[PDB]
């Protein structure tokens, strides 16, 4: 365009999910956030990962909720976990001593691992023993000085005989309480479409038990209790990135779902979603300054019933993306009009 | 302002709801979206309209929900239907063969047509027969390769005798299930203010059964079952316009609630809501460029309990409307300062 | 920077919560909005205040909900009350004649006043009498020509014996109905963490009964009925300000949580939240124009389960704050580049 000029825009991503500042992300792989937290057997991240720089999820992961059901506030949980830099996966309710008189080792084929029927690892499918499902009243007091992510579930069996078998009551209930949180779940029994060869459901629920707060579970049946929980360490700059790009042990300053960015420029256009010390996104292509003469992630953050939000958010993000872009162009269009003197 | 100048702003709307690209809108008239979908008798659009370019609703339509009650996620449904370019109204559950042993032809005065008591046309008010309301288990499998909008309802009668009469049970339930969607409704019996001379209620519910998914209804009473559903064809550019302006068989490129726009200009100010190839809205009035010398609809998108959203959305839309406007003015204010050379 | 210049930015707040246009705010003090509306005894604003220019709340007020429980749509109520310029606190259900055969004067230590156990003042804790809790069916018809804010509550006692004592039924219910509003509450009985030395809960509910609409309460127990309600007078410019700054009987044109603003300038940076005829916020510090040569409140508007909203709103507000700021700077940066001629 002119003899001397400087480009400000970076359009080249290394096409890989590098390290960030020398810390490594968490690759869920086939697994989704729901399976990871719940401990879907196919994930194997449980024992091995507790820290990262960012989380990596694939566009359409299939290994999430193995036993069909509704994961309440799934997207709110995603937004919670975006800011989690690390955590501690601890056995809030030890399987061995917490449930002496309840048949742990409830298992389903819908969650099979290596061919054998199994179940989530961070949860527990309680069932009666010796013909009893005695009322349970287990409690946990968050004394870890970090907010504790607790998971649990309620089994909505397909028929009354199944419930009578698992729990030996027709009219069971699940009560979960804390200092603020109070809720009661009754199982809904009904035949349903046979997802993953299973005709029942499990409703998955969660809450962030704050330090000092005490959470109580009461139940005469239908509880998928927690075996492990998570003590969360919040962190800025981290976040969740949806992508299927490969990784090497490259290190970078910025990261984006298509690839990392390792360049001094202020701007870029590969993708607005970004993590770390990164250039700022624009839609443009031609940011040249003459020197001579002649944010949050997106995509799965909202569910069916929230399409307003998405639209609104689509209206907002996209708006700003345009807005600043224009200004940026204008700024150079001004500056070139000036620095041509 | 100067000898030579070009105006960029269009402030003249033809005051009519023309055709768009030669396709005709859907004029609900007195009827609202709720009555249209539910099939409020006063609408008469059912047999006759299945396609359009945009939907037209009046500010305060009175012919919507004839039998009083809460239409769940009404606004979410509006946002769903904004993107519907057309659909197919089909008899998911034929009245004649789907309910052989249940008294169809339940009717109320609150939905009267031509003086005779009647009922919604896209719904069915089941009632017992021969002293029985046998449990029903009807199912539908979406094999139409398009997402299917299903409607239904639950009758909350004013008193226990009314329920015992209609359904011959005091403790009825309604279970609606799909691959994800699972829900259970119990009728709430109570005397209430006598809206449209009716002391009971009907809670209206809906869902988008995706292709291949199977929806099951179970009930021992209190079901207002569907007679017709809708297979949706999504479409960009379409949308919902709230207005009372008249129509002629004029054709236009753009449309707005006050009137259409047929002009080459890039900008305008008649209304931000617009459909089709349209000039872009601003608040301004004086966009002149010298050549010489000296989005989504709005208004009813949110309910009572969501006034944050509206405020937020009001904060956003109005913001951008201002923002760009300024820039536009600035752009000309700059350009005139330049093109005066 | 240059010999002649004018500053446009105001960075000095008087550090006090003055009057606005000569009208005085409402200082809740220790009390929060919830306690104020509910009538937490420690507030004493009830008899004495019904009008203001704005509301003042402290960052972490401790005197709100005295009897533990969930205040439904608390934040939506805050947003409702932001636009309330005044109201009329009237005894919708007179304690003396509305509940002849129900033991008013239910009291708890969790709401103690001056050492004596007491209870909210705008609510009523009904309890049985002479061994009966006869079904009640009290009603109110809004004939005040202003929307009426109604409050009520449901006692979820810690154990079945407590409920049997207060209400002499194990399976109570609370039905609240209006022309649109219909709802039913069943008490959930469970031992819980002993907040404010209380092991039960009260779920607080509200609604805006519009003029002409009739609200009906039905109950066989567990009702914390209303004693007073509020007829609301909407008003622009008013709002809610969260702060702990002191007050004098100073008068001002604008107000902000850190302090008032009394200055002619168009801009400022002390705080974006503002009330009244105020300069417009920016982040900047150096707005000088040469003449020579060389919105809504924020912070508590959303709850736990809504962190998307907050993020979104944080994304929006902060965005605009930046955006306009830039433009403003640009505008002067342009103008100085021009007015230096
Ligand atoms: C985990 O995902 C795998 C697939 O990624 C599931 O295994 C089977 O995958 C094939 C395709 O490779 C499907 O056709 C099968 O239907 C899958 N199995 C079943 C039983 O349907 C596996 O089921 C998933 N398991 C969990 C726990 O997520
Ligand atoms: C449809 O709306 C019409 C009015 O547009 C309703 O008919 C009556 O309208 C008059 C005013 O013209 C009202 O005073 C009456 O109260 C209305 N009827 C009743 C029974 O109140 C009609 O009821 C509506 N019907 C439906 C099914 O929407
Ligand atoms: C109102 O708030 C006061 C505190 O501002 C509460 O009174 C006690 O305050 C001290 C601290 O000054 C705490 O250590 C005590 O725990 C408080 N009392 C109790 C019983 O815990 C008072 O309880 C509050 N009351 C209401 C109705 O809000
Ligand atoms: C699922 O995970 C397994 C094990 O890592 C892998 O072999 C497979 O490729 C993954 N699924 C897909 C679609 O790649
Ligand atoms: C569990 O059951 C055994 C059965 O003998 C009993 O001895 C024991 O006390 C029970 N423990 C708990 C914690 O319920
Ligand atoms: C309602 O529809 C009827 C029939 O089209 C019409 O006569 C009437 O004018 C409509 N209502 C109003 C207020 O115009
Ligand atoms: C309906 O009832 C009739 C009564 O004789 C019975 O013959 C028939 O089998 C029933 N059909 C269904 C579908 O319930
Ligand atoms: C609570 O209110 C009382 C009475 O006005 C006051 O003495 C006390 O200082 C307030 N609390 C705090 C923390 O200031
Ligand atoms: C209240 O109870 C008394 C008991 O004698 C009875 O006389 C009176 O009719 C009752 N009133 C109401 C309103 O229930």
8 A C-beta contact, residue C276 and residue C252: yes
Nearest CA in chain C to A335: C334
CB of A253 closer than 8 Å to CB of A215: no
Q: Does B7 touch chain C (CB under 8 A)?
A: no
Kind and range of the H or E run holding A33: helix A33-38
Are A43 and A31 in contact by the 8 Å Cβ rule? The answer is yes
**C-alpha span between C184 and B189 (Å, rounded):** 9
Residue of chain A with shortest Cα separation from B325: A323
CB of C208 within 8 Å of a chain B CB? The answer is yes
Distance from CA of B325 to the nearest CA of A (A): 12
Strand partners, B233: B86
Question: Which element (helix H / strand E) includes A174?
Answer: strand A174-177
- DSSP code for B255: E
Q: How far is CA B294 from CA B1, B7, B290, B341, in A?
A: 8, 17, 10, 11
As given in the structure block, the two tokens for residue B225 are 């079952």
Q: Indicate yes or no: CB of B191 within 8 angstroms of CB of C313.
A: no
User: What gap in Å lies between CA B112 and CA B119, rounded to an integer?
Assistant: 7
The answer to whether C112 and C40 are in contact (CB under 8 A) is no
What span, in angstroms and rounded, lies between the C-alpha atoms of B38 and B53? Answer: 21
Distance CA A266, CA A6 (A): 12
Q: Could A193 and B208 be called an inter-chain contact, meaning their C-beta atoms sit closer than 8 Å? A: no
Cα(A80)–Cα(A238) distance, rounded to whole angstroms? Answer: 11
Give the distance (Å) from ligand 3 centre to CA of residue B35.
Answer: 53
Q: Cβ C190–A177 below 8 Å, yes or no?
A: yes
User: Which backbone phi and psi does A334 adopt, to 5 degrees?
Assistant: -65, -50
Helices and strands (H, E) in chain B, number of each type: 5, 24
d(CA C341, CA B316): 38
Task: Specify the 3-state DSSP secondary structure of C49.
Answer: coil
CB of A30 shorter than 6 A to ligand 4: yes
Most distant pair of Cα atoms in chain C: their distance: 92
Give the whole-angstrom CA distance, residue B90 versus residue B85.
17
Contact C75 B323 (CB under 8 A): no
Of C296, A187, C149, C283, nearest to B307 by C-alpha is C296
Helix extents (H) in chain C: 33-38, 74-82, 95-98, 160-167, 307-339
Experimental method: cryo-EM
The H or E element containing residue A321 is helix A307-339
Using a 6 Å cutoff on CB, does residue B284 contact ligand 6? Answer: no
CA distance A5 to A7: 7
Ligand 6 nearest-atom number relative to CA B63 = 1
Of A191, A308, A316, the CB nearest to B76: A308
Q: Confirm if A59 and A29 have CB atoms less than 8 A apart.
A: no
A259-275 core/surface letters (b: 16 or more CB in 10 A; e: else): bbbbbeeebbbbbbbbb
Per the CB < 8 A criterion, the answer to whether C210 and C147 are in contact is yes
* Contact (Cβ atoms closer than 8 angstroms) between residue A183 and residue C192: no
Looking at all shown ligands, the one closest to residue B28's CA atom is: 6
Tokens encoding B137: 């288990």
Adjacent-strand bridge partners of B281 = B268
Residues facing C88 on adjacent strands? C231
Any C CB within 8 A of A323 CB: yes
Residue in A179, A301, A316 closest to C308 by CB: A301
Residues 6+ apart with CB under 8 A from C98: C138
* Interchain CB distance below 8 Å, C309 and B304: no
Q: What angle, 0 to 180 degrees and rounded to 10, lies between the N-to-C axes of helices C307-339 and B307-339?
A: 20
Residue matched to tokens 């009966």? C132
With beta carbons less than 8 A apart as the criterion, state whether B220 and B169 touch: yes
Inform me whether the C-beta atom of residue B179 falls under 8 Å from chain A C-beta atoms: yes
φ/ψ of residue B321, rounded to 5: -55, -45
Burial class (CB in 10 A: 0-12, 13-18, 19+), C105: exposed
Nearest CA to B148 out of B200, B84, B211 is that of B211
| Minimal-distance CA residue to ligand 2 atom 25 | B63
């Amino acid at each position: 365009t002119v003899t001397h000029s400087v480009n400000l825009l970076e359009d080249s991503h290394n096409g890989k999910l590098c390290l960030l500042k020398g810390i490594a992300p968490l690759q869920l792989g086939n697994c989704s956030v729901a399976g990871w937290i719940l401990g879907n057997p196919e994930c194997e991240l449980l024992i091995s990962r507790e820290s990262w720089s960012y989380i990596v999820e694939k566009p359409n992961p299939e290994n999430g909720t193995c036993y069909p059901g509704h994961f309440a506030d799934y997207e709110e949980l995603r937004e919670q976990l975006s800011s989690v830099s690390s955590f501690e996966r601890f056995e809030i309710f030890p399987k061995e001593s917490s449930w002496p008189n309840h048949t742990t080792t409830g298992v389903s084929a819908s969650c099979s691992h290596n061919g054998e029927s199994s179940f989530y690892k961070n949860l527990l499918w309680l069932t009666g023993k010796n013909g009893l499902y005695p009322n349970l009243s287990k409690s946990y007091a968050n004394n870890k000085e970090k907010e504790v992510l607790v998971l649990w579930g309620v089994h909505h069996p397909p028929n009354i005989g199944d419930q009578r078998a698992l729990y030996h009551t027709e009219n069971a209930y699940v009560s979960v309480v804390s200092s603020h949180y109070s809720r009661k779940f009754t199982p809904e029994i009904a035949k349903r479409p046979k997802v993953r060869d299973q005709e029942g459901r499990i409703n998955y629920y969660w809450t962030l038990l704050e330090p000092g707060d005490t959470i109580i579970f009461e139940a005469n049946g239908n509880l998928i209790a927690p075996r492990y929980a998570f003590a969360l360490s919040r962190g800025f700059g981290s976040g969740i990135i949806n992508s299927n790009a490969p990784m090497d042990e490259c290190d970078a300053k910025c990261q984006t779902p298509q690839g990392a960015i390792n360049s001094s420029l202020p701007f870029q256009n590969v993708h607005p979603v970004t993590i770390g010390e990164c250039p700022k996104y624009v839609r443009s292509a031609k940011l040249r300054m003459v020197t001579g003469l002649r944010f949050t992630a997106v995509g799965k953050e909202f569910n069916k019933l929230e399409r307003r939000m998405e639209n609104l958010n689509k209206k907002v993000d996209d708006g700003f993306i345009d807005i600043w872009t224009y200004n940026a162009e204008l700024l150079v269009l001004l500056e070139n009009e000036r620095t041509l003197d």
